[PDB]
Design a protein around this ligand. Sequence first.
Ligand SMILES: O=C(O)CC(=O)N[C@@H](CS)Cc1ccccc1
Ligand SMILES: [Ca+2]
Ligand SMILES: [Ca+2]
Ligand SMILES: [Ca+2]
Ligand SMILES: [Ca+2]
Ligand SMILES: [Zn+2]
Length: 316
Amino acid sequence: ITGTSTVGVGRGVLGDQKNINTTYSTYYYLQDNTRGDGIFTYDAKYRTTLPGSLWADADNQFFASYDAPAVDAHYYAGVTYDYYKNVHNRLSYDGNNAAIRSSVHYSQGYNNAFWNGSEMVYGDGDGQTFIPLSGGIDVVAHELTHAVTDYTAGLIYQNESGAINEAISDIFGTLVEFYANKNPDWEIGEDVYTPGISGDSLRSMSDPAKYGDPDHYSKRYTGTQDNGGVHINSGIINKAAYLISQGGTHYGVSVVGIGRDKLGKIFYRALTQYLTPTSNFSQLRAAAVQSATDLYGSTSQEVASVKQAFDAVGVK
Ligand SMILES: O=C(O)CC(=O)N[C@@H](CS)Cc1ccccc1
Ligand SMILES: [Ca+2]
Ligand SMILES: [Ca+2]
Ligand SMILES: [Ca+2]
Ligand SMILES: [Ca+2]
Ligand SMILES: [Zn+2]
């Protein structure tokens, strides 16, 4: 779309009012020219054919219920682009300002969201298990981070490396939730999961076990479903990351917390410089240790909390 950059206003999935970056050319489109090669949001119109139509609105006001999910996918991808740029000096997912695209209203009552190797896709949920998935900033950033991983370490989506891939996405979506200061926590998908039940979430980083996920390597899932438990075993790494940041005693192993920022800096560095497609949990530990050493010194407290955290979850 070639046209004039402007700013529209809308209401998100959660009923919150926000300004969004649009483009004007007869209609107002969901195309933000202010970030890299642009952020583009599409209408999949309850179908599965992608991407669908670039989103067009006649008056630059996005207050209809059908508008909600596009408003949030659009604004949240903006915030995520900004977090990567500002905090890690990464320009978009490929580091070269690749255009970011998302499709909303994908299929009918689709209870998921995913990065497909080329764009982000969000279901509207069935209204009970989930509300439209783009209404959660941790979900949006989890997605975008899979793009980041794809262009860097390239972690294969199965077994150990796949759980690492899932963990990285969970870690960075929570760091983005904190960055935006959007009621942050160490829970995943809380904003959009089971609209009728308060207080739950899909996964927990603080206590993976609360939902049945392992919090220790000895409790790892060895099976076959979920690509070998990519969404299951990610709980062992999530808990490790939560401890480095926040600290605590887990299974009798004490970890002093080094905080969020440092957590993000060590993870980012591990991801972009030391992890490979086939990296396992033990290699992630070596990666994290080496990053923290690069950054803070071998004898640092930082290096100390990273070894403790992994020893707490039985990795190493
Ligand atoms: O695929 C799954 O089992 C759920 C899942 O984690 N899906 C991911 C896509 S890998 C999207 C998501 C993330 C956070 C919260 C909700 C939805
Ligand atoms: Ca309108
Ligand atoms: Ca939250
Ligand atoms: Ca959260
Ligand atoms: Ca809920
Ligand atoms: Zn994922």
